[PDB]
C-alpha cells in the first residue's frame, strides 16, 4: 500500500499525534390534548399474549443451504437454524417459533427434512416437490427457549423437560394432515401429498426410493425437545456424560 510507504517518512505515531476523525465530535455548545379526544379502540388489546412466528422464506433457506450454513443431509430443526444463524427468535417477545414462507417457491431446489411451527400450503408444496418432508411441530415458551439455545440450558443443571402439548386452539392445526401436523394421523399424509401434487401440477416423488429415506423419515415424538435425547436426562458437559434416572416414579413422569 502507498499509505504505509507514506508512514515510512512521517514522524512516529505517538500519544502526542492522535486526532479524532473530523465530523466525529460536534463542539459542546455552552452559554383536551389531541390523544385524549380520540376514542379508545382495541388495537393492542391482547398483544402480549398473541403468538408470533419469525418468517423463514424459501429464498433464505436455499441461501443457507447454499453456503454450507444449514446441512440438508441431516434433519433441520430450530436448533439447526439458530446455529446456522439463518433465523433469530426470541422466546421473550412471545415468539412461538418459525413459520415457513412461500417466497422463493420457484427456484427452490433442495431436498430437506425441515421442522417448522407453521407452514403455508405453497411452501409445503415447494418442499415436497423436491423430495422433501415438512413437519409442523409445537414448542411451548420454555421448550422453545431450550431448543433455540441448548448450551446455556445445559449449564443450568436441570433435567431436560418434556415439551407440552398445544393449547386447545392449536390442537386442530397440529392434528391435521393438510398442514403436516406432528400429532396428525400418518395414514392421511399420502392423500394430502397427492392433493398438493395434483393441485400444483407436479408429480409426487415417493421418498421410499431415495437413499436419504431414513433421514427424511426422522421425526422426534412429542414431549421430546432434542433428537437423540430423552426428557429427564442431565447433560454433564464438563466431563461429557449423560445421566439418566432409573427411578420408577421419575421415569413415569418423564414418559408421560
Amino acid at each position: 500500500a502507498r499509505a504505509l510507504d507514506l508512514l515510512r517518512g512521517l514522524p512516529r505515531v505517538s500519544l502526542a499525534n492522535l486526532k479524532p476523525n473530523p465530523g466525529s465530535k460536534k463542539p459542546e455548545r455552552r452559554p383536551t390534548p389531541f390523544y385524549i379526544r380520540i376514542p379508545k379502540y382495541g388495537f393492542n388489546e391482547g398483544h402480549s399474549f398473541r403468538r408470533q412466528y419469525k418468517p423463514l422464506s424459501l429464498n433464505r433457506l436455499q441461501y443457507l443451504i447454499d453456503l454450507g450454513r444449514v446441512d440438508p443431509s441431516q434433519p433441520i430443526d430450530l436448533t439447526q437454524l439458530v446455529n446456522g444463524r439463518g433465523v433469530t427468535i426470541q422466546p421473550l417477545k412471545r415468539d412461538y417459533g418459525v413459520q415457513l414462507v412461500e417466497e422463493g417457491a420457484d427456484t427452490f431446489t433442495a431436498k430437506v427434512n425441515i421442522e417448522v411451527q407453521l407452514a403455508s400450503e405453497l411452501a409445503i408444496a415447494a418442499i415436497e416437490k423436491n423430495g422433501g418432508v415438512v413437519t409442523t411441530a409445537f414448542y411451548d415458551p420454555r421448550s422453545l427457549d431450550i431448543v433455540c439455545k441448548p448450551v446455556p440450558f445445559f449449564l443450568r443443571g436441570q433435567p431436560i423437560p418434556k415439551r407440552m402439548l398445544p393449547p386447545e386452539e392449536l390442537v386442530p392445526y397440529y392434528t391435521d394432515a393438510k398442514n403436516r401436523g406432528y400429532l396428525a394421523d400418518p395414514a392421511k399424509f399420502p392423500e394430502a401429498r397427492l392433493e398438493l401434487a395434483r393441485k400444483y401440477g407436479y408429480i409426487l416423488p415417493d421418498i421410499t426410493k431415495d437413499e436419504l429415506f431414513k433421514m427424511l423419515c426422522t421425526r422426534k415424538d412429542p414431549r421430546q425437545i432434542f433428537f437423540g435425547l430423552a426428557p429427564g436426562w442431565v447433560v454433564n458437559m464438563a466431563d461429557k456424560k449423560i445421566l439418566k434416572p432409573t427411578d420408577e416414579n421419575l421415569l413415569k413422569y418423564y414418559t408421560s
Binding site: 390523544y35 376514542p39 379502540y41 388495537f43 393492542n44
Partner: peptide
Amino acid sequence: TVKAVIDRFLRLHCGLWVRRKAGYK
C-alpha cells in the same frame, strides 16, 4: 410510555399511526 396512546392508536411499522374517528358509536 403514555398508555392512553396505546389504548387509542395503532402504530404501523412504517411510522404511520392509525386511529378511529370520534363519535363512531
